[PDB]
Design a protein around this nucleic acid. Sequence first.
DNA 1: GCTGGCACGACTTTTGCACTCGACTAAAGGGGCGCGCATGCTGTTG
DNA 2: CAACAGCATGCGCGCCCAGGGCTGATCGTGCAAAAGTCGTGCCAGC
Lengths: 49, 338, 251, 50, 75, 49, 48, 48
Amino acid sequence: SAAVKEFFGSSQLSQFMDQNNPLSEITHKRRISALGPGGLTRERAGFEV
Amino acid sequence: DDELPVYQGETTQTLQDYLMWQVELTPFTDTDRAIATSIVDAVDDTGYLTIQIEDIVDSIGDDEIGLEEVEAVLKRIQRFDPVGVAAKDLRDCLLIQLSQFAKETPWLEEARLIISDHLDLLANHDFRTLMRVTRLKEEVLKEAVNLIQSLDXXXXXXXXXXXXXXXXXXXXXXXXXXXXXXXXXXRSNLQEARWLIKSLESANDTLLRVSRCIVEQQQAFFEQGEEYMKPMVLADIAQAVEMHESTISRVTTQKYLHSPRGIXXXXXXXXXXXXXXXXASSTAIRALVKKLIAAENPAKPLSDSKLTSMLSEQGIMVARRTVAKYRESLSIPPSNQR
Amino acid sequence: MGHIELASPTAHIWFLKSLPSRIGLLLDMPLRDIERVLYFESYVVIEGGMTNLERQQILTEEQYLDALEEFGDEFDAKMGAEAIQALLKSMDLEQECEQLREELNETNSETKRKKLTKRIKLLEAFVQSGNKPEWMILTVLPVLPPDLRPLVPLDGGRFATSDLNDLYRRVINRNNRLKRLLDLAAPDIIVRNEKRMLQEAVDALLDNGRRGRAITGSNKRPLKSLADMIKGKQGRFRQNLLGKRVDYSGR
Amino acid sequence: GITKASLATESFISAASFQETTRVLTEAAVAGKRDELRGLKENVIVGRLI
Amino acid sequence: MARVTVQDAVEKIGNRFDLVLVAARRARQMQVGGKDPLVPEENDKTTVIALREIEEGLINNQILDVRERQEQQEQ
Amino acid sequence: RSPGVFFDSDKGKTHSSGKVLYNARIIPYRGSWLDFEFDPKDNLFVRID
Amino acid sequence: LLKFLKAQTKTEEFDAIKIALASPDMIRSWSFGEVKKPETINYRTFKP
Amino acid sequence: KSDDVNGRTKMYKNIVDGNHQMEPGMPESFNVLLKEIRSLGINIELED
DNA sequence: GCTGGCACGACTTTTGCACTCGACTAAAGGGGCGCGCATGCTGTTG
DNA sequence: CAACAGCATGCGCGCCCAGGGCTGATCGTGCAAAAGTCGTGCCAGC
């Protein structure tokens, strides 16, 4: 339990939803991020990605 | 470090801080500012108490500087933001708070000066004979007293105690069959330091087991359902796990157990053995003593000896002194009204 | 302020690992030499004339057993930082600087003509300055005033320890344990490891860099130290230096 | 060459606050140098007119 | 009489940095106390009063020095 | 970045002479990484993590 | 006997901030007395 | 108007009174720095 | 003569140095870059 | 076969946020000198 609710609770890839606009909702829920746990620490990524 | 919201501080303002801010901005002389700074520290979070005056005067170390100089300055300080500030005795507090009624208050000014200045000591109980003293009658005096009762006391408006200081509990006592059951709620160098963590992680799991354990033995030592708590000695908890008394009292002193009644964790292990064959230690003695003294004295019996006889009738072997002394304490009106 | 008394004087990593190393180039030793022999490792033979061994040299522990076997006494080698204090204490500035300038006069290659000038301008600075070189490795460690280490009070009460406090707690634990084992008259191995551990501790309280990992099991991060404590951006940018946040302002 | 030339300033207070603080303060602590307060950053950091 | 431009008072004393010193030393007098304005007040603050008196040529470093020596000699 | 076998030229922006330095990293879903590289002197090397 | 001035004790006018090594003796000149124990504030008393 | 504590007070009291004069002092944060460098074995002191 | 408050005693509570050795198997990160300075191994000059 | 000069590899600067997050607990181990408080008795007020 602490691992699962740790993930969904707090995590770079679980964020509060953009709730102004429908279209804000939508575009939040189809978004592809390069950041997080799996990679791309940023400032060090470089200009090619 | 910086660039983050480290808990650097807030710099809040208390009452003495604010009073001193108010002194900074008023036309005091070099000396009068020293008397003012001398008084504002004497003030308390409660307002009214400016403690002893003649120690304020004598604290300056003579050399002239009479009483009247501290008296005037004192009045002006008493006049700053929270209306009545400091002064003494509450009487002069209500005279300073009553100093500004705008003077356009009907019936209130005079009557209020008489009641508040003098004879206010007899206004505690009720009007009665005071009605004959000031010749007032009916609601003329009652409306003035409505104003006097409408004043409030001192400061405690500055406050600056937003911190409620909550308990946070420690171990939860889930109530079972008319009792309680514990659950306890709520490169190579630093790698060797990692190992210490393994021991700390192993002790962290047993930390709840100590709370549930000592909590279970504590539930077995004292009956929950019974009035107050059954008398126990630290020798019982020291008998169970064979731990030292001071250690157990330290764990119960630091952490606080949350049961359904009481937040009250180290008070559940402290009791007396009474040293008597006929018999809940001092807990039910003082508790039930104040409870028996709660309903009593149809008018003004004020008899602690009768309460001592009632305690002796229960089989507790009262000394008529100890029982009366412990019973009359903690704001108890007993023996005071006689 | 405050102060804490250290059993075995250690570290001060601020010197020595700030390149170049003043302790290294002052004593004519490589920083791998002194860095290696500060904690544990070599015994750093000091003084000890009338033998095979020279004044500033090191050796392996097996070579020390062979040394005490053949030479016995008249070889004095202190394994902890006390040999750097001893060597460092025995350094005579005037004569060494003078003979080094003289030696510089007849030199040829520009390589050896540079280092030497570095040592002249350094040691000379210690002479005209009036500092004793001994002071570099420190004995009494001063502690920072309480209010500028505040305690980071919590949501429910029950204050939690700040970042800089942990370093002081740690150093104090190792200082008391090294003192306890030192007054116990115990083997040189375990008190040795305590000397090592305490130089690690003080060097970790002055800079969490210098070597690797540092941090904690708190979620880690390097923590911060008194070096890191220097004004946000490690310049005095923040807080001071053109950067006060300010009053009667709005936006 | 302008960073070399900053760090090499006579006043040990500026140039400490430019770049390298450890280095700076170690040269200065060993040497025993005095600031004199003669430039604009020092005056700022001490809080005096420039 | 709000002053948009100080140039007229800058021709009187070169280097405005000097003007600011003299302006404020003269304005301080009227501000805190122990002086009255040499020029009719237009309701303006004391700072503009001072700059006007500098633009009129009634006040300057030398003039304030002579007034200082006169006030010290009269006291 | 997906798991499997990857190759890189480094674009010979290191040695200042210029070359083609071909390094191959293997990327698992979870586990260690193996990355074979070329030397300026043209020798293969193994890196692990 | 009073007229007590904390604000007036430091008007100190200086030039040239100076810097150097700190001897253990000068350290002890700064020292208010020694901190011998690691713990900070008792969790009961809420006093240091 | 940021870290001079005595000088912020004097400032605001003179403003309320119509003085508009500064009476500048020494900003806190410098003092702090001097303690934090004293916390390494370096003294930095201000010499008159 | 009775009740209440306080003083004296016992107890039992509060308070002060000084140590205690234990140990285990992971937890991961992770697509900049320049720039420079020093140490070290190689190489060529005599 | 000698010291001397050069090429190269490694390490430490910079830029820059980045977000919190937390942790509180714990644990004991004796014995011993000093003190807070409950009990009991004595003295004063009504």
